[PDB]
Amino acid sequence: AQNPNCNIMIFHPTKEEFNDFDKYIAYMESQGAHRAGLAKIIPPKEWKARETYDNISEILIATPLQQVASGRAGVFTQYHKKKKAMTVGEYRHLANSKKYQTPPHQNFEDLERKYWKNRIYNSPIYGADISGSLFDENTKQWNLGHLGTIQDLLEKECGVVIEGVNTPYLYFGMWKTTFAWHTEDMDLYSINYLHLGEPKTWYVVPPEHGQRLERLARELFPGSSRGCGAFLRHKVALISPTVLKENGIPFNRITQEAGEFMVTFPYGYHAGFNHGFNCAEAINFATPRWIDYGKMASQCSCGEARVTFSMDAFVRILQPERYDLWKRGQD
Numbered sequence: 001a002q003n004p005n006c007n008i009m010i011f012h013p014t015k016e017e018f019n020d021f022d023k024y025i026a027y028m029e030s031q032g033a034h035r036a037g038l039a040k041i042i043p044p045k046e047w048k049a050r051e052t053y054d055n056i057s058e059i060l061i062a063t064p065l066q067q068v069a070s071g072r073a074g075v076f077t078q079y080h081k082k083k084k085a086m087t088v089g090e091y092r093h094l095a096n097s098k099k100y101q102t103p104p105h106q107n108f109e110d111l112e113r114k115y116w117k118n119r120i121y122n123s124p125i126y127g128a129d130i131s132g133s134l135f136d137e138n139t140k141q142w143n144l145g146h147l148g149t150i151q152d153l154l155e156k157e158c159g160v161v162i163e164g165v166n167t168p169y170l171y172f173g174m175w176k177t178t179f180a181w182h183t184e185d186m187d188l189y190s191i192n193y194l195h196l197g198e199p200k201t202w203y204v205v206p207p208e209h210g211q212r213l214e215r216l217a218r219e220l221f222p223g224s225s226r227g228c229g230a231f232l233r234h235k236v237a238l239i240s241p242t243v244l245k246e247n248g249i250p251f252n253r254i255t256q257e258a259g260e261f262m263v264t265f266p267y268g269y270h271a272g273f274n275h276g277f278n279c280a281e282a283i284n285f286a287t288p289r290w291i292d293y294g295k296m297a298s299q300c301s302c303g304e305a306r307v308t309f310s311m312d313a314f315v316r317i318l319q320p321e322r323y324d325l326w327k328r329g330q331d
């Protein structure tokens with residue numbers, strides 16, 4: 001078996017290898033990349049997402065989210081407080097202000113130490129889940145707005161046409177902005193391109209060990225667990241690498257820099273944080289190997305999760321027994 005220790009693998013496709021997206025995902029998996037839950041892909045030197053990022057300041061962040069923490073430094077939840085709209089230019093200025101800017105630090109490890117020591121004592125503001133794309137329409141390779149759709153994948157694999165669309169989302173981050181432990185909706189893949197700015201550090205649990213993380217989460221967030229059998233779907237829980245190590249949870253970490261892609265694989269739990277002002281673009285996608293994960297994906301039906309329109313068809317076709325209960329949760 002390839003990659004038996006479930007290490008995060010890093011790939012350097014040539015420009016020829018960068019033409020066929022599906023083929024390269026399959027290649028990465030042939031090398032065992034999916035066992036980690038996360039892979040990094042460094043594009044060939046000849047590639048670019050767009051010409052410049054000089055003209056993005058007028059993009060609107062309609063609902064910036066202030067991420068307010070509760071708990072202890074290594075075990076906490078965060079809730080999202082809605083703030084007034086601001087442009088990306090205004091947001092960048094805010095990120096760079098004394099209140100929110102990245103502190104002096106020696107290296108990525110030093111900054112990581114500072115993040116887990118001090119995150120809960122601040123409430124950074126995130127511009128997340130903004131429908132849109134920063135890929136030039138003329139970028140033909142790994143353009144996250146031009147991928148084969150999940151609906152077409154399901155149709156190709158299972159023969160049933162379904163409603164729904166899937167399009168990319170933009171994320172404008174600042175120091176300490178945080179993404180909670182989660183897998184994707186319906187345990188889909190995701191792909192994330194860091195367009196511009198400071199790095200993003202990722203933590204990931206191998207898919208074959210995801211239930212170990214779930215068991216620990218139930219122990220660490222007991223009220224949340226009683227409220228919902230799938231509460232990590234709420235995407236609000238954080239557990240530090242120190243606490244994961246203390247509890248013997250297998251995981252890995254890696255830092256993504258501007259110009260790099262990350263792919264998360266079905267049922268690969270991940271979490272992380274931004275180092276400073278940045279902009280990422282991400283979208284979910286599927287392959288034939290996803291279908292079995294989609295069929296088995298556990299769902300939130302307590303009402304907290306609240307997902308996109310397109311997930312309806314996924315649950316309806318892949319999980320008909322669960323559909324009634326799940327749909328009741330969506331309403």
Ligand SMILES: Cc1ccc(C(N)=O)cn1
Pocket residue numbers: 214215217218229230231232233297298299300
């Ligand atoms: C605590 C918890 C959260 C989410 C899930 C899941 N598989 O969706 C399972 N257990």
Ligand SMILES: O=C(O)CNC(=O)C(=O)O
Pocket residue numbers: 171178179190191192264280282283
């Ligand atoms: O970048 C973020 O804030 C979160 N991204 C993801 O969880 C992803 O790409 O799957």
Ligand code: NI
Pocket residue numbers: 182183184190264270
């Ligand atoms: Ni994700």
Ligand SMILES: [Zn+2]
Pocket residue numbers: 227228229230231233234300301302303304305
């Ligand atoms: Zn729930």
